[PDB]
C-alpha cells in the first residue's frame, strides 16, 4: 500500500523520512530564529523568521528559541512553522496523500496529544494519523520483545520495562534531566577558567564543545585525583573567530550530573538508581530477564564510557548472582525512528490508524482510546 | 482390544496417559492463567488464557486460578479448557475412539459426577466412560486385597478400609486438610522472619520451598527444644531474582499441622487419629489384618520421616500385642494412576463401561447405578 | 499508682500523651529532615537534623525521610531521634519514672518487637513496658466486646474479628495499601492536567490536596459518566506561592483504589472483599454478630462517603437476611490512642507489664511470652 | 582587641576603613593617571603615576585607566599601586598588624581570587585574610536572614537569594551591565544634541551629568509622549569652562537600558526579569518569603524612582496574591562595607580567617577551601 | 521613470551628477571666497562672492572659507550658495523636476538633517528627497552584502560593519581626524626647514604638496633610521612663483598621524585600532567574514602603501588563524557617489523617497522616520 511518513519530534532535533528506509532523510535542529537588527540593503531577501539549518548558519544576527521544552510544546505557532518546514521543504511530500506516524514521551499531559491530532487533521489534512511511545519504538528496533529501554535525549529521560510483549505501565519512570541541562551546567562551570557564554548563539558553541570533548569516568573520586596530578587531561578547542580555549576537569565533571543530580541542585536520583527502581517495581519472576537486556537509546547515551559505568553501578545495586548486560548499539541515536519505520510497515498495523472519518465523528479526544 | 485413556484429575495436578503403561505420560498443574496487563507489541500471539505448564512459565504477567477446590469442581468452563488441553495437546489422542476412565474422591456431591458424565458424553463424544474411587485404585496398584489406604493430595485426605475385596462403606472417613492448607500455613508463618508473599505467583514459590525444605519430626516438643539450641536447623533458598532467604523451625512446624490441625484453627483430628477411628469402625475380627497393611499414597505423604511418626502414633493408640506396619512404596505419587491403568485392562472389567447407548437411553443419572 | 505514657507510633504521625486523658497532647509527623544546602550566615543555629513539626515548617531547604514503612521500622537511628524528641520535647516527662505503652500492627516480624523492647529498656531506662495491637485498642475505645475492626492509616490496612472478648487469630487479614499509596497515585495521575510534583516537599503538598479535595463515590461508573457531563465537579486550590490549580475526576478516582487495587498495579482485593473474607473465615454461629458491628478506625477512613459505600458493597456480598451496620464514630482518628489510655488504667491490667527485672533476667525475647 | 581592615574593591570606587565603625573612612575613585605631556618647569615634583583623588584633580593633563573591568582585575601592577595608596596614604595603618577582609562578586574566575591572596600574603605581609561575597554582606547589613539581594555598582549586577541563613547557589544570576555601560550609552546618545565627548576626562564629566540629571520613569512609553508635548523636561548644566548644555529625553532614556538591554545591543534580560527568574529557580515553599524582602544595594540603584518601577514590574510578573515589597534604604551605597564591618567583628568569625601558617603550608589555593 | 540627481556633499569637495552614470559629472572644492581688497578698474565685474573652481583660480586676492567642518554644516548661507552653484551652473538641471539624493556621516546631530530637508523642500522646491549614509553606499558600490567599510575623507573617519545586509548600529565608530588635520600638521612641521605658510591660499598649496609627495611607511621606527643615512628621501617642489623647496622626513611623518594621533596632541586611537575595536564589538560568529572584507573608501586612503600597513597591523592585532584581506579599489575616491547612483536607480527603492505631500503634512521631522 501507500507508504507512511515517520516524523520523530524531539526537543533538540527533528528526524523525518519515509517508512521502509534504514535511516531518516532529514535531521535538523528544532529552532526558530528571528532577526534582532534592522535590514538596510535594498534588494535583499526579507524574511520574518528562519527555521532549521538556515537559522543555524546565520545565528550571528538572530535570536534562537526552542518551541519544545521537556517534551512539552510551549509555543504552537513555532511548532506549526517547524512542521510546515518539515513537510514542504525537507521531505517535499504532500501530507494529504500519506499517513503520518508521530512520537511522544510517556506521562505527558493530554492536551499535548489532543492539540497535535487537531493540528494534523485540520491544518495539514492528513488521511490517517497515529502517536506512539518512543521507548517502545526503540525496542521494536532492537528486535526483541523483552527488556527495559533507557531513553535520554535533550529534554526527558525515561525507562519503560516490557516482558514478552506486555506493558508494565505501573513501572514507568520519568526524569526531567537531559542534554540541555548538561549544556547549561557546562556553560555555568566554564566560568571558573575565565570563559563567559551568555547568548543563545554561544549556547550552540558550548553544546558542540560538550559533544566533542566530554566523557564519562568509571570512578569519579579517583579521576578527580588522577587528573589533578598531571596535565594530560587538558584539550584545546578553536572558536569560530580563531581564539583557543583549554578545558580540564570539565570534560568529565559535566556528564557526572547524570549520576549525581545534586550538582544541578535537583532532589532526584541518577539514571542508574532510576533504572534499578524501575526494575524492582516489577514482579520477582521477571526481573531476571530485565537485568540481561538493558537497552540504551538517545543522543545523551553516546558519551564515551557510559556502558561500563552503568554496568558497574547496577551490578553493585543488584544481587551477586544476576547477570547484568547493557547493550549499546551503534546508530542508537536513530533507533526511535527506525522502530517507527518498522512498526508503520507491518501488515497487522494497518487497522490501527486513526482515520479522518473517526475524527470527524468524535473530535480530537479519540487519541486517548486508540493510541494509548 | 482398543486401549483406554486414564485421566487422574487432582486438585493440584493432572495425571494422564494410556492404559497398559507403567507411568503416566503427561503430568502438569491444573491451572488457568489470564493476563492482567495490556499487550502492546504488534505481531505477538494474543491468547485469552494459558493452561498448564505454559501458565507456569509466564506467571509473572498472569493471574493464576485453580478450577478444583477440595475435590469439587468450582468452575466448569475452566475444567473444560483443562480437559481440552489434556486431550488434544498433551496426549494427542482422539477421545472419540477410546473409552475414558476418570477418578473422584469419596463422599462428594452427586452433581459433580453428573456434570462430569454429561460433559464427557456431549462435548467430547466418548464411546464409553467410568468413574472410580482413587483410594481403591491405589490398592489395585498395591497388588493386595486387604488393607486401609490413606490418600492425601492437594485438597482431600481420606481413608478407605477393604477386607478381601469387600467394601466397608460405613468406615470411610474424609478430612478437608491437605497440601494446599500447608502451603497457606507456611506462607502465613514465614512473616515472622520478615518475608512477605501475597500474589498467586509467589504462592507457587512458597510451594517449592515447602517441597524442598520441609520434613516431619519424630517428636515435636523435643525437636522444638533441640532446634533452639544450635543453628544446624537453618537452610538457605535462592529466589528467582537472586535473593537469599533462610528458614529454621518452619521446616518441621509446617507439616506438623497434619497431626495437630489446631495450628490452622480447625476442630478436627490428625491423620493418625483419623486412621485409628476408621479401623475401629470395623468388625473386631478384621482389625488385625488392617493394622498390618496401612498403605500411603499421594503427594502429601512424600515428606521425609512420615512413616516412622505414623507407626509410632498408631502403635501408641493400638493395643500392645498388635503389629502395626505402614508401607510407603516409592512412586506412590502415581499409584492411583497405576491402579487405574491396571483396572482398565482386566478382561472382566470390559462389561462395566457406561456405554453411549445407555446414556442416550437414561441420561446422566446412570452414573449412580453403574458406578459407586 | 503512677500514670503511664501512651505512645501510638504510626507510619505517618506520632500520637502521644498521658493515660487518663480524653485526647493525646502531642500529634506531629514522623519525619526527619536534613539540610541539602550549606549554611553561610555566621551566627545561625547549626543543627544537623530536624524532627517533627520543625521539619515541616522549613521543608524548603530540607530532604524529608520517613523511618517507618508499612508498619516496619527501616532506620532505627531516626526512630531513636523521633522517640527522644517525643519524650523530652513534646511531653516533657522523664521515661525513667513512667511505664510506657506501645502499639504495633499484626503479622509483623519479630525483630521489630525485640529491637523496640531493647531500645526502651537500654536507651531510655523505663521501669515497665508493653506492646499492644492497634485494632484491639480501637475496640477497647468502642466500648464493646464483639465486632470486627477495619483499621487503615498510612502504611497498613488490617481487620481483626473478636467475639465476646475472645480472639480469632486465624481470621486476621492484612493489606499493604493505605494513605501513602493513595498520595503516590494522586501524584502520578495529576500529570494528566499538566502538574508535576517530584520532590519530598511537593509530596506534602499533594497529601494536603488529597485531604482537602478527595471523596468516595457511591457508584464509580455512574460518577465517571456524570462528571463528564458538566463542570460542577471541578475545584480550585492555591499553592504556597500563589498559583492556582484545578482538579476534576481525580477527586474520586484517587480513593477508588481502596476498592479496586488494580489501579495501582496490584494483585489484591479491596477492603470490602477483605472484610468479607475475614468474616467468612469465622464460625457460622458468630458471623451474625460480626455483620452488625463493623467498626472503622484510622485516618484513611475519614473520606466523605465511605460508610455508605462499604455498607452497599458488603450488603451485595452478604446473604439477603443479614443486617449489615458500619459504625464510623467521630474522632476515630485517635481511637487507638483512646483505647490504649483506657487499657493502661485498668486495675486488672497492672500485672501484665513487662518489668525491668524480667528483662534483665531473660533478655528481649520475653516480648513473645508476655505480649501477643 | 586587634581590629580588622575592611576593604571593598569595586570597579568604580574603593571603600576602606576600620572594623567597628558605622561608615568607611576613605572613598576615592579606583583610577591610575599618567601624564601625556612633557614637564618643562625645572624645580617641579616629578611623578610617574597619580592615584585616586589626585588623578581626578589634574585630569586635564593625564590619561585615565581603570584596572578593574566587570569585577575582574585586568592589570595587576596598577592594582598593587591602588592597594599601596589605600594602605599607606588613606588609612595610614600597617597591614602587617591587622587582618584584612576583601570582597568579590560571585561567579568570578578563580585565578583572580588566587592572585588576591598571593599578593596580600607576599607583598603586604598580612597576618590573616578573608574574601567574602558582596551581596551576602549587604544582607548582613540589612539585619535579616531571608531575602534576595540585587547588587548593582559600576561593573556587575547580580542577585543572590538566601532563606533562613542558607545559601541557594544554583539560583545565583549574574549580569554584565552596570553604571559604566550607562555612562557610555549616555555619551553616545548626547551626540543627537550636538555634544561630543571622547576622552577620559570628558567621560568623567558625562558620569557627573548622569549622576546629577538622570531618573527612572514609571511608564516609558507614556513618558516618551508626555515629554514631547512641553519643555518642562529640559534641564541645564554648566561645564568646567563656563559653557551651558541642555538635556531632554536623555534624562530617562539613559537608565531605561537597565530594563531594556537591547538599547545597548545586548541579548539579555532586564534586572526585573533577572530577579524574577532568580526567584523562580528556588523551591515553591520559599518564594513567598523572597517576594516580601527584595533588598537593593549599590550605586546604580540610587536613581530616583527605581523602587516603584521594580515593584510594578515584579507585581506584573508574579501571581496576584503575592505581596511584593522592595526595600531601598538610605546608605545603601555603603551597605556592603557596613555588612563586612559587622561580619569581621563577630566572636564566632575569629576562627575562619586564613592564617599565614596555613598559606605557607598549602599555597594560594587554600582560598577555594576556606572561602566560598 | 525620471532619473535622480546624486549629490555627495563632503567637507572638501562636492561630487554631483545624474543617476545612471559611471562617474560624477562635476567635482569642485566646497569653498566660498570673498575679495579682501577694493576694485578700482571701472568696467569690471563686481561680484560679492566666488564659489567653487573660480575661487581657486583667483585665490590671490580672496579669503577662503569652508562652510562644512567635521561633517557638520557651520554656515548655512554659504551652503545655500554652494548648492545653488551646483544646481544651476555645474549640472544645469532644474531641481523642481528631479528627485535628489544626499549623503551624510553617521552619529551627526539631528538639526543637520532637519535643516537640509527644510532647505531642499522650501528653497529649491524638489519633488522628492532622501538622505543616506556614505559608508553604506560604498558597500553598495563594492557589490557585496558583508564587510566593514573604513571611510576617510577630509573631515571624518568612520567604520560601519554589515553582515548579510543587516546593520550593526552598536558597533559604528567615528573619529574626528582626517585629511584636513594632516594638512595642518604638515603646514606646522614644515617650519623646521624654514618654510612658513600662514594664509588660506598657502594652505591650498600645502595640500597639493601633501597630495604629491607624501606616502605611508611600512615600519616607522626603521624608516626614521634608514632615511637618516642618505638623501634618497629628498624631493623637490616648485612654488607658483618659481621658488624651489625640498622635503625629507615630512613625506612619511605627516600621514603617520593616522596611526599615531598623539603627534597632533590627540587622545585617540589610530585607524587600525579603531577598525579592530569595531570588529570586536560584533558577535563571535560574524568576525570571520568581516576580517576578510575590509573595504577602503575616500581620498585619505589614497596614500601609497596604506593597504600593506593596515594588513600588517590588523594581522598583528587579530588571532593567527584568521585571514585578513584589505581591498583597495581603484576609483575608490568616487565609490560613495557610485553607490548612491546604484541605489537611486533600483526598482525597489522607488517607494522610499520622502515626497512633498508627506513633508507638507509632517514638517521637516519626517527625516527621522523615513531615513535610518
Ligand atoms: C570565551 C570567549 C572568549 C575569550 C576572551 C577567549 C580568550 C582566549 O579567553 C581569555 O582571554 C580568558 C580571560 C580571562 C580573564 C581573567 C582570568 O583570570 C582568566 C581568563 N577571560 C576574559 O577576558 C573574559 C572576561 C569576562 C567578562 Br567581560 N565577563 C565574564 C564572566 C565570567 C568570566 C569571565 C568574564 N571575557 C572577555 C569573556 O569571557 C568574553 C565575554 N567571552 C566571549 O567573548 C566568548 C563569546 C568567547
Ligand atoms: N556525541 C555526543 N556525545 C554526547 N552528547 C551528544 C552527542 N551527540 C548529541 N548529543 C546530545 O544529544 C542531544 C540530542 O539528542 P536527540 O536524541 O537527537 O534529542 P531529541 O531526540 O530529544 O531531539 C543534544 O542535547 C546533544 O547535546
Ligand atoms: N516431595 C514432596 N514433599 C512434600 N509435599 C509434596 C512433594 N511433592 C508434592 N507435594 C505436595 O503434594 C501436592 C500434590 O499431590 P498430588 O498427589 O498431585 O495431589 P492431586 O492428586 O490432588 O493433584 C502438592 O500440593 C504439593 O504441595
Ligand atoms: N481528612 C482526611 N481525609 C482523607 N485522608 C486523610 C485525612 N486526614 C488524614 N488522612 C490520611 O491518613 C493518613 C494518616 O492516618 P493515621 O492513622 O493518623 O496515620 P498512622 O498510620 O501514623 O496512624 C495520612 O496518610 C493522610 O493522608
Ligand atoms: N546618585 C546617583 N545616581 C545614579 N547613579 C549613581 C549615583 N551615584 C553613583 N552612581 C553610579 O554608581 C557607580 C558606582 O557605584 P558603586 O557601587 O560605589 O561602585 P562599585 O562598583 O565600585 O562598588 C558609578 O558608575 C556611578 O555612575
Ligand atoms: N592622492 C592623494 N593622496 C593623499 N591624499 C589625498 C589625495 N587626493 C586627495 N587627498 C585628500 O583627500 C581629501 C579630500 O577627499 P574627499 O574624500 O574628496 O573629501 P570629502 O569626501 O570629505 O569631500 C583632501 O583633504 C585631500 O588632502
Ligand atoms: Mg528523542
Ligand atoms: Mg490425587
Ligand atoms: Mg495508626
Ligand atoms: Mg560594589
Ligand atoms: Mg567623503
Author numbering:
A (entry chain A), B (entry chain C), C (entry chain B), D (entry chain D), E (entry chain F): 5 to 376
Extract from the study:
The mosquito-borne parasites (Plasmodium spp.) that cause the disease depend upon an unconventional actomyosin motor for both gliding motility and host cell invasion. The complex includes the malaria parasite actin filament (PfAct1) complexed with the class XIV myosin motor (PfMyoA) and its two associated light-chains. One of the class XIV myosins, PfMyoA, is essential for gliding motility and is the best-characterized of the parasite myosins. It is unusually small, consisting of just the canonical motor domain and neck region that bears two light chains: essential light chain (PfELC) and myosin tail interacting protein (PfMTIP).
For direct comparison, we also determined the structure of the non-decorated Act1 filament at an average resolution of 2.6 Å. We reconstructed the Act1 filament alone and obtained helical parameters that were similar to our Act1:MyoA complex with a similar rise and a 0.7° smaller azimuthal rotation for the complex. However, our highly-resolved density of the Act1 filament allows us to see most of the side chain orientations and details of ligand binding for ADP•Mg2+ and jasplakinolide, as well as putative water molecules, including several in the vicinity of the active site. The Act1 filament has an internal cavity, which is extended towards the filament exterior. We modelled density in the cavity as a chain of water molecules, but we cannot exclude presence of other solute molecules. The end of the cavity is formed by the side chains of Asn116 and Trp80. In monomeric Act1, the cavity is much shorter compared to the F-form. In muscle F-actin, the cavity is limited by the bulkier Ile76 instead of Val77 in Act1. In our structure of the ADP-bound filamentous Act1, the side chain of Ser15 points away from the nucleotide, not contacting the ADP phosphates, thus more closely resembling the conformation in crystal structures of the ATP-bound state. Instead, the Ser15 main chain NH group interacts with the β-phosphate.
